[PDB]
């Protein structure tokens, strides 16, 4: 039961958002995921190292692994 774009989840377990993109990063090794935070609790605006993986509001883009992310819709 992996994650799908447009699904509600938690980035890092403490942050909440919606999955936008899933894949590796140009600055981090391994598999990563993109989640749009519900509030300004992120680090990027949907880009990393000059690479935009998805579109999201300012300080709403958070990049965290797929295992670190979980669906909030219990």
């Amino acid at each position: 039961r992996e994650l799908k774009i447009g699904d509600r989840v938690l980035v890092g377990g403490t942050k909440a958002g919606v999955v936008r993109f899933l894949g590796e990063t140009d600055f981090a090794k391994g598999e990563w995921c993109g989640v749009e935070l519900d509030e300004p609790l992120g680090k990027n605006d949907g880009a990393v190292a000059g690479t935009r993986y998805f579109q999201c509001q300012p300080k709403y883009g958070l990049f965290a692994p797929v295992h670190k992310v979980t669906k909030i819709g219990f």
């Binding site: 980035v11 890092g12 377990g13 403490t14 942050k15 990063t25 600055f27 981090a28 680090k43 990027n44 990393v48 958070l62 990049f63 965290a64 692994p65 670190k68």
Partner: peptide
């Protein structure tokens, strides 16, 4: 804890 610092 469930590990932290794995997000950007």
């Amino acid at each position: 804890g469930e590990e932290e610092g794995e997000e950007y």
